[PDB]
């Protein structure tokens, strides 16, 4: 049989609950990703400005 876990339910990083029971769309570790209504996408990077002290 098959089990389908769908993201974009807006649960997000839940490192305090028991991992065994956190709902689809929830993760226990990881970084540099943020939850949106589209799914689990990746965050952008950094450019440089002209300011320099």
């Amino acid at each position: 049989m098959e089990v389908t876990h769908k993201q974009f339910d807006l649960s997000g990083f839940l490192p305090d609950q028991a991992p065994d029971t956190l709902k689809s769309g929830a993760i226990s570790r990881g970084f540099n990703v943020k939850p949106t209504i589209l799914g689990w996408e990746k965050s952008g990077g950094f450019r440089e400005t002209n300011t320099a002290p």
Partner: protein, 156 residues
């Protein structure tokens, strides 16, 4: 620069001339920095890790929602991904005998969505966990599914 150089069609300042932009002091960097939609840092790459522990594999409620089963072993055949990115990623599979144990990781392989979106591996264990590591400009994950079968009973 050649087409391989960094940038966006709009010079950045022009973007959102209506609002400010965060500036960051980074210690080993000579100049202040700002966020960009592009994911290249100055030029160097950023890695992302997506990890879930003890995925819910078991029976399904009549309402259509799955729930965890802690009393039987399970056997995993394939993992299918629904993503929006086009660039390739790595997938790791973890297995533990029971709750008291620790996770042990196996390298499932590399997934290139345009060529295929399925991955095949044969494992039996009490509980399963998955980790996704990507170094690419774009990575959007919509869902995934697992095909499995029940394989007896759990002892230790």
């Amino acid at each position: 620069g050649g087409w391989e150089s960094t940038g966006l069609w709009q010079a950045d300042e022009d973007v959102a001339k209506y609002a400010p932009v965060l500036h960051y002091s980074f210690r080993d960097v000579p100049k202040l920095l700002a966020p960009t939609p592009q994911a290249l840092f100055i030029d160097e790459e950023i890695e992302a890790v997506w990890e879930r522990e003890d995925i819910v594999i078991g029976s399904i409620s009549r309402d259509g929602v799955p729930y965890q089963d802690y009393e039987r072993n399970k056997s995993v055949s394939s993992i299918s991904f629904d993503v929006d990115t086009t660039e390739p990623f790595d997938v790791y599979i973890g297995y533990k005998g029971s709750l008291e144990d620790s996770v042990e990781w196996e390298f499932a392989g590399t997934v290139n969505p345009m060529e295929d979106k399925r991955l095949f591996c044969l494992l039996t264990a009490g509980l399963f966990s998955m980790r996704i590591i990507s170094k690419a400009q774009t990575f959007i994950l919509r869902s995934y599914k697992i095909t499995y079968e029940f394989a007896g009973e759990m002892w230790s």
